Every structure is written in C-alpha cells, then in structure tokens.
Amino acid sequence: PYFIQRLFNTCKSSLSPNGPVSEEALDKVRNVLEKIKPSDVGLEQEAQLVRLPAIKYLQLHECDSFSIGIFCMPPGSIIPLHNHPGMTVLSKLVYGSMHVKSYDWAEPDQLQARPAKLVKDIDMTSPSPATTLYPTTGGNIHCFKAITHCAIFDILSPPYSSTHGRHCNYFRKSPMLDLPGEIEVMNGEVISNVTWLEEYQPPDNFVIWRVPYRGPVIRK
Ligand SMILES: [Fe+3]
Numbered sequence: 001p002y003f004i005q006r007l008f009n010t011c012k013s014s015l016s017p018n019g020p021v022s023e024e025a026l027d028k029v030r031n032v033l034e035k036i037k038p039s040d041v042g043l044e045q046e047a048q049l050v051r052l053p054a055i056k057y058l059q060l061h062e063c064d065s066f067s068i069g070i071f072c073m074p075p076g077s078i079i080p081l082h083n084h085p086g087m088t089v090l091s092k093l094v095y096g097s098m099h100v101k102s103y104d105w106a107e108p109d110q111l112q113a114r115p116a117k118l119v120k121d122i123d124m125t126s127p128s129p130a131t132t133l134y135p136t137t138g139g140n141i142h143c144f145k146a147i148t149h150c151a152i153f154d155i156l157s158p159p160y161s162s163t164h165g166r167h168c169n170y171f172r173k174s175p176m177l178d179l180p181g182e183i184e185v186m187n188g189e190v191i192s193n194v195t196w197l198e199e200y201q202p203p204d205n206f207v208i209w210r211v212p213y214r215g216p217v218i219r220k
Pocket of ligand 1: 082084142
C-alpha cells in the first residue's frame with residue numbers, strides 16, 4: 001500500500017481545482033509516479049501478457065482537484081484523438097509498448113478546421129519516463145495506439161468536467177483541402193507540417209469498459 005498511498009498523498013498536497021499549485025509541486029508528483037511498478041496498482045498479472053478490442057478504464061480516484069485512472073489496452077486498440085481543455089496531465093507507461101501522437105494548436109484560442117502543430121509521433125516502451133501535458137503545450141491533443149498489452153497511469157488536474165466546460169473533445173483531420181501545410185503566426189513564427197483538425201463525435205467502434213480497481217487500497 002506504500003506507493004499508491006504516497007502518490008495519492010502527494011497529489012492532495014500538490015494539486016488544486018485550478019491545476020498544479022506550482023511546477024515544483026508537480027515535479028514532486030512526477031518523482032513519486034516515476035517509481036511505479038505493476039504490483040503497486042495490482043497489475044502484475046496483466047503485466048506478464050506483454051508478448052475492435054475493448055479498453056479497460058480503472059478509476060482510482062476522482063475529486064475536484066484531480067483524477068487518477070489507468071487504461072489497460074490490448075494490442076492494436078486505439079484511444080482516438082482528443083484534448084484536455086485547461087488541464088495538466090501527468091502520465092506514465094506502467095508496462096508494455098504503445099504509440100503516442102500529439103499536437104498543440106498553432107495559435108491561441110479565439111466547429112471549423114483549426115491548424116495544429118505536431119509535438120510527438122513515437123513509440124514508447126517500458127520503462128519510459130513520465131510525460132506531462134499542459135493546457136497549451138506538451139501536446140494537449142493526443143491519441144494512443146497499443147503495440148503490446150500496455151497500461152497508462154494518468155493523473156489529471158483539474159479533472160474533466162462537462163458542467164465546468166472541460167469536455168473530452170475528439171478530433172479528426174479535416175477532409176477539406178486547399179489548406180496550407182505551412183503557416184506564419186504571431187511574432188513571425190513559421191510553423192511547418194501543420195495538421196488541420198476539426199471536432200467530431202468518436203466512432204461507435206470506441207468502447208471503454210469501466211472496471212473496478214483491485215490493487216492496494218487508498219485511504220482517502
Ligand atoms: Fe488524454
């Protein structure tokens with residue numbers, strides 16, 4: 001019970017309904033989470049399978065300051081492109097390999113196609129360092145594709161909240177053409193390899209099964 005309790009404790013200290021109280025506070029969460037192993041959250045058995053399919057979501061905690069969850073992905077399964085408005089997400093591969101692709105908007109905010117720049121397009125393999133995304137940097141729009149069985153540990157602050165207007169919006173590449181691959185933004189910054197994204201409702205193909213958490217109990 002040590003690790004998950006120490007992790008939850010650091011989150012209560014470091015995270016607020018406006019987000020991480022500070023970068024130093026956030027790094028303290030990251031330092032704990034970097035030491036996670038499958039046994040700490042009860043996934044030692046799923047972790048040895050590393051060698052159209054439904055994804056499992058384990059909710060470890062939700063409150064107004066932060067959310068903690070784990071996605072267990074079977075090979076070839078996909079988390080489609082989505083964003084995290086106003087949110088910071090700390091995230092960590094527990095086991096397995098996956099492909100991540102992420103973007104950030106080319107410009108600051110003001111259902112039409114909007115230009116975004118590529119930030120990450122790479123496979124990750126355990127052990128792999130914890131990643132961080134911010135409201136406007138670090139790849140706030142991302143998608144995941146499982147190579148092996150894999151499991152992502154996710155800390156979101158603040159959590160999604162549709163009544164507070166922090167929805168999980170899904171995105172597709174715009175079919176519209178005569179859209180330029182290279183644009184110039186504020187301060188004359190040149191953005192090459194632009195991708196034009198538009199909101200869309202995720203396909204009925206996408207199934208998240210909520211599954212009860214069965215690891216070391218958290219004392220809340
Ligand atoms: Fe996400």
